[PDB]
mmCIF file with all atom_site columns, C-alpha atoms and ligand atoms in Angstrom:
data_model
loop_
_atom_site.group_PDB
_atom_site.id
_atom_site.type_symbol
_atom_site.label_atom_id
_atom_site.label_alt_id
_atom_site.label_comp_id
_atom_site.label_asym_id
_atom_site.label_entity_id
_atom_site.label_seq_id
_atom_site.pdbx_PDB_ins_code
_atom_site.Cartn_x
_atom_site.Cartn_y
_atom_site.Cartn_z
_atom_site.occupancy
_atom_site.B_iso_or_equiv
_atom_site.pdbx_formal_charge
_atom_site.auth_seq_id
_atom_site.auth_comp_id
_atom_site.auth_asym_id
_atom_site.auth_atom_id
_atom_site.pdbx_PDB_model_num
ATOM   1   C  CA  . UNK Q 1 1  ? 14.004  0.332   12.467  1.00 48.61 ? 2  UNK Q CA  1
ATOM   2   C  CA  . UNK Q 1 2  ? 11.909  -1.548  11.279  1.00 48.98 ? 3  UNK Q CA  1
ATOM   3   C  CA  . UNK Q 1 3  ? 11.013  -5.572  10.450  1.00 47.72 ? 4  UNK Q CA  1
ATOM   4   C  CA  . UNK Q 1 4  ? 13.094  -7.279  7.371   1.00 45.74 ? 5  UNK Q CA  1
ATOM   5   C  CA  . UNK Q 1 5  ? 9.260   -7.750  5.797   1.00 46.24 ? 6  UNK Q CA  1
ATOM   6   C  CA  . UNK Q 1 6  ? 7.883   -4.367  5.959   1.00 42.84 ? 7  UNK Q CA  1
ATOM   7   C  CA  . UNK Q 1 7  ? 11.307  -3.427  4.681   1.00 45.34 ? 8  UNK Q CA  1
ATOM   8   C  CA  . UNK Q 1 8  ? 10.846  -5.504  1.549   1.00 46.13 ? 9  UNK Q CA  1
ATOM   9   C  CA  . UNK Q 1 9  ? 6.767   -5.039  1.019   1.00 49.41 ? 10 UNK Q CA  1
ATOM   10  C  CA  . UNK Q 1 10 ? 7.318   -0.326  1.312   1.00 53.85 ? 11 UNK Q CA  1
ATOM   11  C  CA  . UNK Q 1 11 ? 10.338  -1.515  -1.733  1.00 53.26 ? 12 UNK Q CA  1
ATOM   12  C  CA  . UNK Q 1 12 ? 7.375   -3.676  -3.261  1.00 56.02 ? 13 UNK Q CA  1
ATOM   13  C  CA  . UNK Q 1 13 ? 5.073   -1.080  -2.798  1.00 52.69 ? 14 UNK Q CA  1
ATOM   14  C  CA  . UNK Q 1 14 ? 7.349   1.816   -4.325  1.00 52.26 ? 15 UNK Q CA  1
ATOM   15  C  CA  . UNK Q 1 15 ? 8.431   0.064   -7.399  1.00 54.61 ? 16 UNK Q CA  1
ATOM   16  C  CA  . UNK Q 1 16 ? 4.784   -0.850  -8.051  1.00 56.72 ? 17 UNK Q CA  1
ATOM   17  C  CA  . UNK Q 1 17 ? 3.868   3.039   -8.492  1.00 56.10 ? 18 UNK Q CA  1
ATOM   18  C  CA  . UNK Q 1 18 ? 6.874   3.190   -10.054 1.00 54.38 ? 19 UNK Q CA  1
ATOM   19  C  CA  . UNK Q 1 19 ? 6.106   0.760   -12.486 1.00 55.71 ? 20 UNK Q CA  1
ATOM   20  C  CA  . UNK Q 1 20 ? 3.028   2.159   -12.719 1.00 51.86 ? 21 UNK Q CA  1
ATOM   21  C  CA  . UNK Q 1 21 ? 3.623   5.751   -13.945 1.00 47.72 ? 22 UNK Q CA  1
ATOM   22  C  CA  . UNK Q 1 22 ? 6.019   4.359   -16.467 1.00 46.86 ? 23 UNK Q CA  1
ATOM   23  C  CA  . UNK Q 1 23 ? 3.617   2.326   -18.142 1.00 47.79 ? 24 UNK Q CA  1
ATOM   24  C  CA  . UNK Q 1 24 ? 0.720   5.664   -17.806 1.00 48.94 ? 25 UNK Q CA  1
ATOM   25  C  CA  . UNK Q 1 25 ? 3.398   7.369   -19.527 1.00 45.93 ? 26 UNK Q CA  1
ATOM   26  C  CA  . UNK B 2 1  ? 11.177  -4.907  14.314  1.00 44.83 ? 2  UNK B CA  1
ATOM   27  C  CA  . UNK B 2 2  ? 7.882   -3.227  13.430  1.00 44.46 ? 3  UNK B CA  1
ATOM   28  C  CA  . UNK B 2 3  ? 4.617   -3.067  15.001  1.00 41.52 ? 4  UNK B CA  1
ATOM   29  C  CA  . UNK B 2 4  ? 2.710   -6.261  15.323  1.00 46.58 ? 5  UNK B CA  1
ATOM   30  C  CA  . UNK B 2 5  ? -0.207  -4.392  12.854  1.00 45.49 ? 6  UNK B CA  1
ATOM   31  C  CA  . UNK B 2 6  ? 2.479   -2.744  10.514  1.00 45.55 ? 7  UNK B CA  1
ATOM   32  C  CA  . UNK B 2 7  ? 3.735   -6.331  9.856   1.00 49.01 ? 8  UNK B CA  1
ATOM   33  C  CA  . UNK B 2 8  ? -0.476  -7.748  9.607   1.00 47.75 ? 9  UNK B CA  1
ATOM   34  C  CA  . UNK B 2 9  ? -0.567  -5.154  7.172   1.00 46.70 ? 10 UNK B CA  1
ATOM   35  C  CA  . UNK B 2 10 ? 2.277   -5.783  4.912   1.00 47.80 ? 11 UNK B CA  1
ATOM   36  C  CA  . UNK B 2 11 ? 2.000   -9.465  4.320   1.00 51.67 ? 12 UNK B CA  1
ATOM   37  C  CA  . UNK B 2 12 ? -1.954  -8.269  3.595   1.00 51.49 ? 13 UNK B CA  1
ATOM   38  C  CA  . UNK B 2 13 ? -0.328  -5.420  1.132   1.00 54.37 ? 14 UNK B CA  1
ATOM   39  C  CA  . UNK B 2 14 ? 1.860   -8.498  -0.310  1.00 58.38 ? 15 UNK B CA  1
ATOM   40  C  CA  . UNK B 2 15 ? -0.995  -10.750 -0.490  1.00 55.94 ? 16 UNK B CA  1
ATOM   41  C  CA  . UNK B 2 16 ? -2.696  -8.511  -2.602  1.00 54.76 ? 17 UNK B CA  1
ATOM   42  C  CA  . UNK B 2 17 ? -0.952  -8.018  -4.871  1.00 54.73 ? 18 UNK B CA  1
ATOM   43  C  CA  . UNK B 2 18 ? -0.495  -11.825 -5.768  1.00 54.22 ? 19 UNK B CA  1
ATOM   44  C  CA  . UNK B 2 19 ? -3.233  -12.329 -6.343  1.00 54.37 ? 20 UNK B CA  1
ATOM   45  C  CA  . UNK B 2 20 ? -3.955  -9.351  -8.633  1.00 55.32 ? 21 UNK B CA  1
ATOM   46  C  CA  . UNK B 2 21 ? -0.758  -10.575 -10.604 1.00 55.35 ? 22 UNK B CA  1
ATOM   47  C  CA  . UNK B 2 22 ? -2.587  -14.009 -10.600 1.00 55.64 ? 23 UNK B CA  1
ATOM   48  C  CA  . UNK B 2 23 ? -5.911  -12.667 -11.615 1.00 57.70 ? 24 UNK B CA  1
ATOM   49  C  CA  . UNK B 2 24 ? -3.948  -10.873 -14.449 1.00 58.86 ? 25 UNK B CA  1
ATOM   50  C  CA  . UNK B 2 25 ? -2.292  -14.027 -15.541 1.00 57.03 ? 26 UNK B CA  1
ATOM   51  C  CA  . UNK E 3 1  ? 10.219  4.388   15.289  1.00 58.97 ? 2  UNK E CA  1
ATOM   52  C  CA  . UNK E 3 2  ? 11.195  2.895   11.218  1.00 57.13 ? 3  UNK E CA  1
ATOM   53  C  CA  . UNK E 3 3  ? 13.343  2.444   8.784   1.00 56.71 ? 4  UNK E CA  1
ATOM   54  C  CA  . UNK E 3 4  ? 13.676  5.644   6.973   1.00 58.76 ? 5  UNK E CA  1
ATOM   55  C  CA  . UNK E 3 5  ? 12.516  3.715   3.814   1.00 58.80 ? 6  UNK E CA  1
ATOM   56  C  CA  . UNK E 3 6  ? 9.168   3.161   5.213   1.00 61.76 ? 7  UNK E CA  1
ATOM   57  C  CA  . UNK E 3 7  ? 8.612   6.456   6.343   1.00 63.87 ? 8  UNK E CA  1
ATOM   58  C  CA  . UNK E 3 8  ? 9.092   7.467   3.045   1.00 65.56 ? 9  UNK E CA  1
ATOM   59  C  CA  . UNK E 3 9  ? 6.561   4.954   1.684   1.00 66.99 ? 10 UNK E CA  1
ATOM   60  C  CA  . UNK E 3 10 ? 4.161   5.564   3.815   1.00 68.11 ? 11 UNK E CA  1
ATOM   61  C  CA  . UNK E 3 11 ? 4.270   8.977   3.024   1.00 67.68 ? 12 UNK E CA  1
ATOM   62  C  CA  . UNK E 3 12 ? 4.039   8.626   -0.291  1.00 69.51 ? 13 UNK E CA  1
ATOM   63  C  CA  . UNK E 3 13 ? 0.890   5.679   0.169   1.00 70.31 ? 14 UNK E CA  1
ATOM   64  C  CA  . UNK E 3 14 ? -0.720  8.221   1.308   1.00 72.15 ? 15 UNK E CA  1
ATOM   65  C  CA  . UNK E 3 15 ? -0.553  11.162  -0.625  1.00 69.43 ? 16 UNK E CA  1
ATOM   66  C  CA  . UNK E 3 16 ? -1.468  8.446   -3.531  1.00 68.48 ? 17 UNK E CA  1
ATOM   67  C  CA  . UNK E 3 17 ? -4.252  8.165   -1.850  1.00 68.52 ? 18 UNK E CA  1
ATOM   68  C  CA  . UNK E 3 18 ? -5.203  11.456  -1.370  1.00 69.29 ? 19 UNK E CA  1
ATOM   69  C  CA  . UNK E 3 19 ? -4.116  12.687  -4.541  1.00 70.62 ? 20 UNK E CA  1
ATOM   70  C  CA  . UNK E 3 20 ? -6.300  9.762   -5.928  1.00 67.36 ? 21 UNK E CA  1
ATOM   71  C  CA  . UNK E 3 21 ? -9.949  11.236  -3.860  1.00 61.66 ? 22 UNK E CA  1
ATOM   72  C  CA  . UNK E 3 22 ? -9.279  14.498  -5.143  1.00 63.16 ? 23 UNK E CA  1
ATOM   73  C  CA  . UNK E 3 23 ? -9.109  12.937  -8.615  1.00 64.43 ? 24 UNK E CA  1
ATOM   74  C  CA  . UNK E 3 24 ? -12.212 11.627  -8.875  1.00 62.29 ? 25 UNK E CA  1
ATOM   75  C  CA  . UNK E 3 25 ? -13.883 14.869  -6.259  1.00 58.34 ? 26 UNK E CA  1
ATOM   76  C  CA  . UNK C 4 1  ? 7.207   -0.564  17.535  1.00 58.07 ? 2  UNK C CA  1
ATOM   77  C  CA  . UNK C 4 2  ? 6.736   1.612   14.218  1.00 53.74 ? 3  UNK C CA  1
ATOM   78  C  CA  . UNK C 4 3  ? 6.559   5.485   13.770  1.00 50.88 ? 4  UNK C CA  1
ATOM   79  C  CA  . UNK C 4 4  ? 3.395   6.474   14.448  1.00 47.74 ? 5  UNK C CA  1
ATOM   80  C  CA  . UNK C 4 5  ? 3.366   8.094   10.614  1.00 47.91 ? 6  UNK C CA  1
ATOM   81  C  CA  . UNK C 4 6  ? 3.519   4.624   9.774   1.00 47.72 ? 7  UNK C CA  1
ATOM   82  C  CA  . UNK C 4 7  ? 0.824   3.057   11.630  1.00 46.85 ? 8  UNK C CA  1
ATOM   83  C  CA  . UNK C 4 8  ? -1.505  5.307   10.577  1.00 45.92 ? 9  UNK C CA  1
ATOM   84  C  CA  . UNK C 4 9  ? -0.739  4.430   6.983   1.00 48.49 ? 10 UNK C CA  1
ATOM   85  C  CA  . UNK C 4 10 ? -1.336  0.945   8.127   1.00 52.54 ? 11 UNK C CA  1
ATOM   86  C  CA  . UNK C 4 11 ? -4.483  1.535   9.665   1.00 51.09 ? 12 UNK C CA  1
ATOM   87  C  CA  . UNK C 4 12 ? -6.186  3.371   6.069   1.00 49.96 ? 13 UNK C CA  1
ATOM   88  C  CA  . UNK C 4 13 ? -4.480  0.863   3.798   1.00 49.97 ? 14 UNK C CA  1
ATOM   89  C  CA  . UNK C 4 14 ? -6.546  -1.608  5.409   1.00 50.06 ? 15 UNK C CA  1
ATOM   90  C  CA  . UNK C 4 15 ? -9.663  0.215   5.940   1.00 48.98 ? 16 UNK C CA  1
ATOM   91  C  CA  . UNK C 4 16 ? -8.838  1.076   2.209   1.00 48.10 ? 17 UNK C CA  1
ATOM   92  C  CA  . UNK C 4 17 ? -8.711  -2.675  1.203   1.00 48.06 ? 18 UNK C CA  1
ATOM   93  C  CA  . UNK C 4 18 ? -11.887 -3.648  3.654   1.00 48.37 ? 19 UNK C CA  1
ATOM   94  C  CA  . UNK C 4 19 ? -14.133 -0.344  2.023   1.00 47.78 ? 20 UNK C CA  1
ATOM   95  C  CA  . UNK C 4 20 ? -13.304 -1.859  -1.111  1.00 46.43 ? 21 UNK C CA  1
ATOM   96  C  CA  . UNK C 4 21 ? -14.493 -5.034  -1.147  1.00 45.12 ? 22 UNK C CA  1
ATOM   97  C  CA  . UNK C 4 22 ? -17.122 -4.308  0.701   1.00 45.66 ? 23 UNK C CA  1
ATOM   98  C  CA  . UNK C 4 23 ? -18.090 -1.961  -2.254  1.00 46.19 ? 24 UNK C CA  1
ATOM   99  C  CA  . UNK C 4 24 ? -16.812 -4.790  -4.684  1.00 49.04 ? 25 UNK C CA  1
ATOM   100 C  CA  . UNK C 4 25 ? -19.886 -7.773  -3.358  1.00 49.79 ? 26 UNK C CA  1
HETATM 101 CA CA1 . LIG J 5 .  ? 10.260  -10.837 12.486  1.00 51.40 ? 1  LIG J CA1 1
HETATM 102 CA CA1 . LIG J 5 .  ? 10.553  -0.638  15.181  1.00 53.80 ? 2  LIG J CA1 1
HETATM 103 CA CA1 . LIG J 5 .  ? 1.637   -1.037  19.617  1.00 54.71 ? 3  LIG J CA1 1
HETATM 104 CA CA1 . LIG J 5 .  ? 18.068  0.534   6.970   1.00 54.61 ? 4  LIG J CA1 1
HETATM 105 CA CA1 . LIG J 5 .  ? 8.942   10.188  13.887  1.00 55.36 ? 5  LIG J CA1 1
HETATM 106 CL CL1 . LIG J 5 .  ? 7.784   0.110   10.559  1.00 53.03 ? 6  LIG J CL1 1
#
């Protein structure tokens, strides 16, 4: 398990990547 | 909980994102 | 140890970096 | 504490940011 802040940061990072990909596609 | 280094990295990453957004807006 | 979500996010981030470098090279 | 993989990823991310800043400056 991780600090809740780190979990949130990881989810934001993933969604950032996905939104970038979809924008480019 | 997480390694203090990872917590710091996560906070830096978040603030990086926010500053980028505000710059673009 | 970390939340499985955070581990996945970290691996994705690393591979993102590597693919970017290889693209640029 | 965190998974060693996550710690490494966090350090890489930080150094990535620092190198980017120095390049821009
Ligand atoms: Ca905490
Ligand atoms: Ca932990
Ligand atoms: Ca430590
Ligand atoms: Ca969990
Ligand atoms: Ca492990
Ligand atoms: Cl963690």
